[PDB]
Amino acid sequence: SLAEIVKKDDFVLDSEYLVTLLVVVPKLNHNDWIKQYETLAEMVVPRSSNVLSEDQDSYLCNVTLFKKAVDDFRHKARENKFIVRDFQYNEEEMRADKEEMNRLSTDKK
């Protein structure tokens, strides 16, 4: 669940011309991803990648970009086997997971 790692400051949203995209990469392949993500589409600013967290296998990052770039970026991410997992700061869903985790763990006791 993204609720354990997501925070608003890593995102660009609520905008006419701007979007955020989310992609996971294996921890070795991350060294290519750091440069290659900026080549997947035009209209991407340098240093747009913000890591939410690492793990034993991989890194997940947000990428910030203009709205025209997004479908070329996602399609060329898939072509290069970079896995798209868009979770655009779903505040109601992260709160629902936390609320039910707290409630069910309490109610079971």
- By CB under 8 A, name the binding residues for other proteins: 12, 15-18, 35, 38-39, 42-50, 64-66
Which H or E run contains 17?
A: none
User: Which of 23, 49 has the CB closer to other proteins?
Assistant: 49
Q: List, in sequence order, every beta strand (DSSP E) within 27-95.
A: 49-54, 58-66, 83-84
What residues pair up with 24 in beta bridges, in sequence order? 60, 83
User: Which of 45, 84 has the CB closer to other proteins?
Assistant: 45
**Smallest separation, CB 35 to other proteins (Å):** 6
User: Which of 42, 71 has the CB closer to other proteins?
Assistant: 42
